[PDB]
């Protein structure tokens, strides 16, 4: 189900360096900020 899907996806994103970096370094607050200019 959804709880499994989403945790597996997070695990998969943490398995590649670029996404791991984004997720570990970027604060929640900065998200709207980055998102605004995406």
């Amino acid at each position: 189900g959804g709880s499994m899907e989403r945790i597996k996806e997070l695990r998969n994103l943490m398995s590649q360096s670029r996404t791991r970096e984004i997720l570990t370094k970027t604060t929640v607050d900065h998200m709207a900020i980055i998102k605004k200019y995406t």
């Binding site: 597996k8 994103l13 943490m14 997720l23 995406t38």
Partner: protein, 73 residues
């Protein structure tokens, strides 16, 4: 722009829905917020019968793995 940032943002919304206001802590990293939320939801959901013991255990183990991968970048 970047679809990688969009992939991360999209995933974040699965832990913190546009049913917006059960907000994450602004100063937490994205992965720290998501793992914290995953754990709280898995206990409540296991308690409530929405997930089974096998699903709960696998979720908690994945979280601890993810937490291991945070502490080393």
């Amino acid at each position: 722009d970047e679809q990688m940032y969009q992939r991360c943002c999209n995933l974040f919304e699965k832990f913190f829905p546009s049913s917006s206001y059960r907000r994450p802590v602004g100063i937490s990293s994205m992965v720290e917020a998501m793992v914290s939320r995953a754990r709280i939801d898995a206990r409540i959901d296991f308690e409530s019968g929405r997930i089974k013991k096998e699903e709960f255990t696998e979720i908690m183990k994945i979280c601890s793995t993810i937490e291991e991968l945070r502490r080393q970048k």
